[PDB]
Amino acid sequence: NRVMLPKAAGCGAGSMIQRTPKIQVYSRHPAENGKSNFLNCYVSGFHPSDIEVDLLKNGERIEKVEHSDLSFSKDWSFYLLYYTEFTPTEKDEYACRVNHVTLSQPKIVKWDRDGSGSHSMRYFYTSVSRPGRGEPRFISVGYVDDTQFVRFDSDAASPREEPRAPWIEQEGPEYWDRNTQICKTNTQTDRESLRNLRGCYNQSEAGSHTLQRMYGCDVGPDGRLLRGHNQFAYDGKDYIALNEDLSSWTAADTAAQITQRKWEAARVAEQLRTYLEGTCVEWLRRYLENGKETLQRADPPKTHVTHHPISDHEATLRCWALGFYPAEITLTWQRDGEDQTQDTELVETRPAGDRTFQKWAAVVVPSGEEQRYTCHVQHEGLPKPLTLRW
């Protein structure tokens, strides 16, 4: 259940970070001809949020592709999963084509075939002005751990808080009407906040800017609050955050300090603390119980090692983790028991599309010395860490 958020203050009386997308193209399951599968293109770590993604087959654009609702990572960078059902063959070449302001031409990536008891609730808000093209777009999503359960999109035909997980559907009309109202109000707040922030930085009304907000709570196995959060970013960078004491603020610069003093005088922190200690944890406990059959089940990783020769003198060992939930995992390579921190390559953890996640860690090793390396796997669905070799 959401909370009403305060408005950023105007200043009366300067940097844009651009991150280019990471792109991973992969199937949900190990690919086997004839058997239907899912082709995924995961685009992550990008900023700003506008992006164009096509799945290609032998160079041709695939229609019907779906994608996830826009959300972002802890560093404020955005991620999206684009996916389609497909049946691979031997000589069909699949690819993902991505365009973004950081790319001087579209980038094509081919498909290369070769628990704990603690829980979190988060709401993620993205508001993007579009000068000359109407009002800002507002998209927000709610998660319990790594499971999305609501979305709101101000560009939907009828903007509403919408269910996105089966266990939320049982909530009555009061729940949907109330949280819709908070969204529609949080919409107009962020709209005035975008205007105020533009003025604080003397920015032109001709340019697009991004407001991102996150709040929610962490609970332990017994249901008690472990930590509350309420963060605010402008153009992909920290702006103002509620501190861990839920009673003071950290402001990034002199503009954000004006907002800090406004929220201090209005006692915003006290209102947020009341929400985080009460409503937030109370509804998180309720969701955990209503969805316990999926939300309180950790799926351990299915793990294996593959060998890919880099010529006849060295080779890549790749440690694979598949089908795990939640997403948090640690993969480490060791040589004679010592971690290969310097030489281990780690891809970003990526969604399978079926709620589970995937990751690999790779290290190049001297040929004939593969047997000295072991992959170490830590996941909350594993009673003990796993160790594997090639």
Numbering used by the authors: 323 to 335, 999 to 1099, 1999 to 2274
Wording from the paper:
To understand this difference at a structural level, we sought to compare the two highly similar MHC molecules presenting an identical peptide. To this end, HLA-B∗39:01 was produced as a sc-pMHC, including the covalently linked NRVMLPKAA peptide for HLA-B∗39:06. The peptide was positioned as in the HLA-B∗39:06 structure, with the first eight amino acids (NRVMLPKA) occupying the peptide-binding groove. The other dimorphic residue between HLA-B∗39:06 and B∗39:01, though not in the F pocket, is at position 97. In HLA-B∗39:01, Arg97 can hydrogen-bond to the carbonyl group of Pro6 of the NRV peptide, while Thr97 of B∗39:06 is unable to do so. In this assay, NLRP2 320 to 328 bound to HLA-B∗39:06 with an IC50 of 14 nM and to B∗39:01 with an IC50 of 35 nM.
Human leukocyte antigen (HLA) B∗39:06, B∗39:01, and B∗38:01 are closely related class I MHC allotypes that nonetheless show differential association with T1D. HLA class I molecules consist of an allele-specific heavy chain that is associated noncovalently with β2-microglobulin (β2m) and a presented peptide. The α1 and α2 domains of the heavy chain form the peptide-binding groove, which is characterized by six pockets designated A-F. In general, two well-conserved primary anchor residues occupy the B and F pockets and are located at position two and the C terminus of the peptide, respectively.
